[PDB]
């Protein structure tokens, strides 16, 4: 349980943490892109949509990132075939970065997510140097497109796994 050593952002706030937000990076060694969160508080969970735009078309999935009982760890429960994802809210100043943790079937991968472009160097910096730490290289390191994002998707085009 790699994700059990990293520490959740102290007093995380999901009132401060929702709305929207864009992925920067990706940090995984896991063997149609522009990807954007919309994040919505729902108690102590959070109700988060993906939404990713796939050759013109924008697709939108609904998850629920349930309370663990820590604040900043989450999680998005198996779904029969689908193995449960722990999250980890840890690095973020709510404003204009985030840096999450997700673990699948004991596999650590870390994200960087902005408020909006350009994120600041600093902390693209921090996000690799975060990156090493989790013991994944520099070609492990996926960075998405600046542009093809999306945010809404038809009634044809959701998934809800709630």
């Not at 650590?108 to 472009?117: D, E, G, H, I, N």
Request: hydrophobic share 45%; proline share 3%; with cysteine.
């Amino acid at each position: 349980s790699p994700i059990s050593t990293i520490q959740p952002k102290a007093n995380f706030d999901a009132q401060q943490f929702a709305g929207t937000w864009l992925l920067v990076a990706v940090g995984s060694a896991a063997r149609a892109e522009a990807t954007t969160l919309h994040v919505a508080p729902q108690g102590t969970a959070m109700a988060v949509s993906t939404f990713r735009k796939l050759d013109g078309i924008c697709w939108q999935v609904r998850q629920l990132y349930g309370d663990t009982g820590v604040l900043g760890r989450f999680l998005l429960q198996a779904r029969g075939a689908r193995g449960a994802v722990h999250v980890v809210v840890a690095e973020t100043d709510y404003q204009s970065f985030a840096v999450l943790y997700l673990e699948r079937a004991g596999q650590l991968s870390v994200k960087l997510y902005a408020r909006s472009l350009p994120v600041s160097d600093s902390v693209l910096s921090g996000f690799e140097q975060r990156v090493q730490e989790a013991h994944l290289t520099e070609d492990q390191i996926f960075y998405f497109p600046k542009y093809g994002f999306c945010e809404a998707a038809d009634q044809f085009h959701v998934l809800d796994e709630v």
